[PDB]
Write a protein that binds this ligand. Sequence first.
Ligand code: AGS
Ligand code: AGS
Ligand code: AGS
Ligand code: AGS
Ligand code: MG
Ligand code: MG
Ligand code: MG
Ligand code: MG
Lengths: 329, 491, 256, 253, 318, 160
Amino acid sequence: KRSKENLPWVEKYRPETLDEVYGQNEVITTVRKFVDEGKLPHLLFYGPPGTGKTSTIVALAREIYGKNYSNMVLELNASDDRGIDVVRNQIKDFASTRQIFSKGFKLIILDEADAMTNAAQNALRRVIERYTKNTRFCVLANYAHKLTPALLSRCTRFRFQPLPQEAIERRIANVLVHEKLKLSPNAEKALIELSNGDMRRVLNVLQSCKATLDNPDEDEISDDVIYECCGAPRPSDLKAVLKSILEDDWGTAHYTLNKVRSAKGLALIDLIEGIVKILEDYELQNEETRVHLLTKLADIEYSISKGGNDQIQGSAVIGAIKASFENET
Amino acid sequence: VREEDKLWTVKYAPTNLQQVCGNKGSVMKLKNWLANWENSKKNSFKHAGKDGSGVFRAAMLYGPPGIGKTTAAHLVAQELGYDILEQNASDVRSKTLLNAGVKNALDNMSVVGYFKHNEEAQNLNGKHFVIIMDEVDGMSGGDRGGVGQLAQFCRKTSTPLILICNERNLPKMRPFDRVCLDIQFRRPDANSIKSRLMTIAIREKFKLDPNVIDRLIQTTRGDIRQVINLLSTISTTTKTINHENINEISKAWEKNIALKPFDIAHKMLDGQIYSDIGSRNFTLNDKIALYFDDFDFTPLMIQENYLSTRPSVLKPGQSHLEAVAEAANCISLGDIVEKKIRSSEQLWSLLPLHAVLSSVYPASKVAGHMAGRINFTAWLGQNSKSAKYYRLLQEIHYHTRLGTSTDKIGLRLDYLPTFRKRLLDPFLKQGADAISSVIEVMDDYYLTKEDWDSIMEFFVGPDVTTAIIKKIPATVKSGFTRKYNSMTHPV
Amino acid sequence: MLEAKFEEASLFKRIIDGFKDCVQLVNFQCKEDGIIAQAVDDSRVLLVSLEIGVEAFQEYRCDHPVTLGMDLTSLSKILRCGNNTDTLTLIADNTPDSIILLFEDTKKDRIAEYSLKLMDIDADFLKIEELQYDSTLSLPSSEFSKIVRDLSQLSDSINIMITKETIKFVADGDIGSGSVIIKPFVDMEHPETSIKLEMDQPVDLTFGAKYLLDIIKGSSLSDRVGIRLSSEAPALFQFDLKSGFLQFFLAPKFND
Amino acid sequence: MLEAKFEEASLFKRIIDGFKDCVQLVNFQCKEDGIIAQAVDDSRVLLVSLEIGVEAFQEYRCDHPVTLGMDLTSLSKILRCGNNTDTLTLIADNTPDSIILLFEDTKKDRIAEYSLKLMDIDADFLKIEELQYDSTLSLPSSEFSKIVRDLSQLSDSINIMITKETIKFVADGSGSVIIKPFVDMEHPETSIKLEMDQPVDLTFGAKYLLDIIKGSSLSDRVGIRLSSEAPALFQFDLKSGFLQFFLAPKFND
Amino acid sequence: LSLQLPWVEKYRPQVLSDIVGNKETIDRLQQIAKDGNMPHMIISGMPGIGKTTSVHCLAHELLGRSYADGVLELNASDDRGIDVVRNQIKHFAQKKLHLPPGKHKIVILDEADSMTAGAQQALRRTMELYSNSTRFAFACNQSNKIIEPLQSRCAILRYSKLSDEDVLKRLLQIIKLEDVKYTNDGLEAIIFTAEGDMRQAINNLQSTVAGHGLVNADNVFKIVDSPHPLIVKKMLLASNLEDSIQILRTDLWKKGYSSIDIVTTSFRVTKNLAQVKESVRLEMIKEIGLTHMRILEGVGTYLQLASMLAKIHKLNNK
Amino acid sequence: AEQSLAQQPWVEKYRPKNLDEVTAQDHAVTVLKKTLKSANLPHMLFYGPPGTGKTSTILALTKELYGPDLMKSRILELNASDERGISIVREKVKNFARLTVSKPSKHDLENYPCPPYKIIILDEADSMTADAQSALRRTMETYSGVTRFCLICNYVTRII
Ligand SMILES: Nc1ncnc2c1ncn2[C@@H]1O[C@H](COP(=O)(O)OP(=O)(O)OP(O)(O)=S)[C@@H](O)[C@H]1O
Ligand SMILES: Nc1ncnc2c1ncn2[C@@H]1O[C@H](COP(=O)(O)OP(=O)(O)OP(O)(O)=S)[C@@H](O)[C@H]1O
Ligand SMILES: Nc1ncnc2c1ncn2[C@@H]1O[C@H](COP(=O)(O)OP(=O)(O)OP(O)(O)=S)[C@@H](O)[C@H]1O
Ligand SMILES: Nc1ncnc2c1ncn2[C@@H]1O[C@H](COP(=O)(O)OP(=O)(O)OP(O)(O)=S)[C@@H](O)[C@H]1O
Ligand SMILES: [Mg+2]
Ligand SMILES: [Mg+2]
Ligand SMILES: [Mg+2]
Ligand SMILES: [Mg+2]
């Protein structure tokens, strides 16, 4: 009963080939030139979560060998064991033999190598270059400080830039062609801004919004549907809260904040992010306003990250904003 | 064998005791000890000699690396006609294997020694052994025989046993102090090595100015072999070592030696490096790497002796007390960081921050001149004493849980004064007739005599029982403990 | 539905003991012809392939071709829980679910019905054993095991060289080097001890000793092991069973 | 280039097995007359010498004398591969950086060569010129191994006493075995012979004697030579040569 | 499919003269290989400057055709515990091999800084005893991880950072041997981003050549992503808080750099900030460490980095 | 079972049994209810303040999806009581995720909509180590067609 439609939109729309990977054009073009010319150096993909590293490496493994890549490619992910003994036995044996299936250079894909111990990386530091004419190494990472400098220097560094807006619009258009659905321009822009580079959250919230229409073939996903599905504060309510905090007095500002955060069940952690994102564009006529505005708000965010209270932190944010916006006058 | 294939350190090795540069007194004392070893054995090592070394079966040479310890030992061994049975770190030394291989050679004679020379009578010790244990510090395969078996061997031997090591004050080497006789080979001066290097330069056809030897032995503090290797490496291309290239030679051949948990604190608390001049000669990166020599004791040492110095970096207006206050604040922050490091999630990437907060910042805040001698950390033993007392309090609490119905801490905090008043003072004010009441009140709380002894030592301040216990007569204690071992106690 | 009732019990035990510590996850493909399975190493160097027809089973009934994946450790755990005097019955429903192993004693009614939850393996079935080997040979399994576990003490690599009517096993290591040179010969009063060889081109290629030490463990099944070697091809170590065959495809080391 | 051939590899296997536990490295000299090899214990208490002449070799070829220094652990590892049905051949070339052991099968077309990399031993070959031992005795090897096994099970120190043409083996509870020299013509192998010049009182350790008695498989008789100021000599007889052990005495505490 | 070796391995110097590293040490090793009396040597330096290549070419030139049996190379991948050092290295040191007069058996211990202290202790006398037939060559990145006794018996060879001139010379050599069109600005950018790392320089050059064909500052800065620790150093020294915030947002955040990576790089840069004084450096490091503690606890938003920069500016300005 | 519920305190007595009982989150319950008629269920991450319906709504969803018969054999539940470590996440979680979905009986196949995937609910994932959550990454991505993952937490920042 397991069909292709039984997958979440995060994995249902996984790029099969390199042509279906958008955004990282500068890396994909050179990777295609690498595989066409025949010299594939040791690759180190470094990128934020949800950019296309693993999808690109699987598409490359498919395009290099064929439609059966897991047969001859060795893939070590964070789910497997990657101790020093593993590097000594398994990886070193796979690197020093020929292929059972085809006749070509083997490919060792070390996914999430930042989770490797320093001893394992030190042991791999020599085996990655002792067997070079037979096997190649691909190291995927999100944090480039866990990798030792020695291992980091032996691999061609490719940084996966976060998905730009155009690529995400292209992928949304592709999905809306592959799925009977309609998306408003303003709702699409709101989704772009909410994505924050992450390509998986786009598809996740897109499926979640397609699930809350009661008819997905005629009704279009409006901005209200997108803002309600994730519980994020709409820019209108955000601007109203900011204006009430800045201009109005304490009682009415507190009342407005409470009435806005209780009309849709918002969260202070999202209101703070929206407020700082909309406030970083102001033309503060000094350097000490921004200092307090950032310090106090970051302290409040760190305290919220521990779930202390919910009504004291709102008044804390209000007082912090007001006290910060006092050096201007 | 080829003379050209020498390592520049085997061709110039001392072939007699007159060529060991430096430590003349120590090598002479070792020679006299090995000489009168037999005369001391005749008296069963009970009587000490003129130097007080005749009451020790074994000798232990200790000192920095590269001074001639192994060479001097081998030389005094071959000189006195003995036969050398040398075991080193490459040999697997362990209690079982040591008892298997070396124990049988303690009371036996050399088999090869009989066939060396026996026609003319040169001495009566040409058929004996000198067991030279070398590099006894490395006992990774010496789980139980590293310091435990060798200590017993030093006592129960019948042949000269010479041990050679590098660090004597190591806590592992503790058993060796009170069993054998230890001698210290110090770093040699700049005269004997000067003469040796002069002869080497003469016999090697290159130029070497005598004033260079001082800086050469300076950069190589106590490592003569390192000096010989340094000369050998550079004599391949440049044949003139003078004041025109000494700077680069010295800077490129510095010794990146480690530091001990003692001089680490003295260096980090020295108020000269934190000056504007010293800040670029010993950079902050070096101050942080100083912590990485020993990240186990450095914070403890700093916390122990950060307020026992006279500061020199005090800002105008800032006094000593406020400086110690800021240093202690940073120490508390570093302790918080250290707890967050060794806690869950195994956050080890936060180590340099802990180095700055715990070690570097309080030092920089109180950097001056050491008042007296640097004190070792006291928290290490205080924590063990606290744990030992917590175990006893836990035992007493789980003995009296049947009656108290209070937490473990509130017992020590509240019940113990009343327990002292009900258990001890009846012995002082009433003599030996209050034995029954004490026995009964201990029986009601399921206490024992060991529980009473543990309770008594707990009290602090004005109420100190370890002195009052010695004021009550000695016969009533015996009567009390005898009455205890007679009556039955329902646990 | 699938019902496979064996003639004995320890047959499947000996069949599974071949890959005890050699591979972990296997996928038995059961059809009307028999049970065929293959499993790739954890390091993807050697591939085990076992085929057992309807000859070893007492009763065999397979309606549609089924594929049951399972881990070998759990399979051995289940198999050790059965006495060697009962009968083993593999039972599978219409759709592939937890395989049912059945132990029935022949004198007392003792029904041991174990269920093993299947593993979902990416069964990427290839097409092997269809390639021409430039050299083939066959020799007793005892002699091969002797040679392998005698040369494994001097090194970790073993070079096999098939030349004109000569087989050579070379072990080059640190403490020394060994070389065993055998020649093809066929005995008539003892046909099982004969060493047969058919070579078309000279062959020289190396293998690891850690994998040969696990391959020779299959010598408990048969007494005559066959070895097929070819350049740019895996080495075929085949043990012939009374009903099928168990073959290891080993990847040769790459020389500089 | 040296080429020696044993008619049966079992002799060399047992020869190596006899003293494989007391030493690890051994220098085999190779001359025209035969092979002589002496090896000192790692504790320098027990020496093991051996001499095998051309009578044991089916073929022997040695152009120039050469010293082959080899380890015993690797040699035993190599020897355990060969079978008791093959002929062993030791082969060495000029400047022998290695030594070849060829096992050839007489009734099968199987030839197995094993190369061993020689060691660089500081060959301080001590002369073994004869010393007039005070006591020279001989007795069966099996009974010697037995009595050493009995006395060693009680303590470590073993006292040996030769006085008034009588043998005392003592171990200090305390055990003692008394031996009298009686020559039997019916069973000549059990004839305990003893030529005494001076009373000899020596003392040895346990493990050394336990390792010497391990060699009680090549000769049915052992010869013990003793002197108060000389090491004990335990000699086993061979079809061609002999295997001797020199054990240093203990202190007189 | 056809497969060619990368430029890193294809153009690895197999002869000691082709090395463009430190001239004094390379000439020393050349004269050693010419004479043959090679002593034990610990070669230590930054990653990617040619230590392993140096020792390998030295051993090759010293042993000629005897490299197969006269060289024992143990690296971080092979086992190097107490058992290995005591058994295999010892058995190889005592291995009798007849070499030319001025030659010796070589033991190349690579990544020696990863060996246990007990292994080095056991290796001390193993090396000291058979010095007349076996020489030892350690190659490491942190010579402080090697114990003092072991380091004493050998000659210390400290390798410095590869100067821009040497990297440029090797770059011109590779380009001339590869027939690649290049502009001087592109090569200067490659040298600037290499941070004095020959392997990284060759890798970036090969990547740029295979991606665009024409080595030019445009394509180099497109495919090279100019070094990270320099942008953070520029950010930490901004005049106003607005400039530092803009540099953090546009150059670091928008370009997809992890927050923990940013904090770690800022800490490492402040550790080596020779411009500012000691107390201000320590206070900035303390604030960066507070921010790092906040990052590791899960909250790693851009607001935390903004507050870190705000506190750093509050300290440096007052 | 009714007497046991009556004896139980009001917290467990009135625990939501269906997706219509949770009258708190109309933005998250409708997305799960529409998954019933559909078949694509994404990896869920319920996060929020203590006592808002997460642990109850996940149980109600699993019930309404599978039925009380298939519930025991189709879902694995790893809460903070169990030992969730790097070794456990590597071995047991992967073993259960890399498994074949149980065969639904005719009763369950007729009454309840049985989806072709199991469900591993890691409750209170804010107590896991960072290495365990790191190892969970490819575990919850490769076996996405036979297994889905539902995490529950009060602090979304604590999750990597
Ligand atoms: N560049 C891209 N183009 C198209 N879809 C993408 C792209 N990047 C991510 N996606 C989508 O996001 C899914 C997950 O992307 P992955 O590449 O697996 O994430 P990742 O690069 O592995 O990052 P990690 O490993 O989770 S930190 C894919 O299956 C696609 O559906
Ligand atoms: N005082 C000395 N006079 C002359 N040569 C010396 C002296 N000390 C050391 N050497 C030389 O150093 C080499 C011997 O090293 P040793 O100093 O004996 O080693 P060590 O003292 O045991 O220190 P270790 O064991 O390596 S920590 C020979 O080349 C000697 O010539
Ligand atoms: N001085 C040099 N001249 C020419 N090529 C060099 C030089 N240094 C490094 N390389 C190149 O760097 C690659 C090999 O460098 P490595 O041996 O990995 O450096 P390394 O000194 O061993 O540092 P490690 O081992 O990674 S810590 C080859 O492609 C060499 O061509
Ligand atoms: N949305 C809801 N609708 C109805 N009853 C609810 C709801 N949320 C909580 N309850 C009641 O509160 C009880 C506990 O709910 P839970 O789902 O365990 O809360 P919670 O989200 O798990 O809190 P945690 O696990 O401490 S974060 C339920 O048994 C109900 O009686
Ligand atoms: Mg990934
Ligand atoms: Mg020494
Ligand atoms: Mg290297
Ligand atoms: Mg709950």
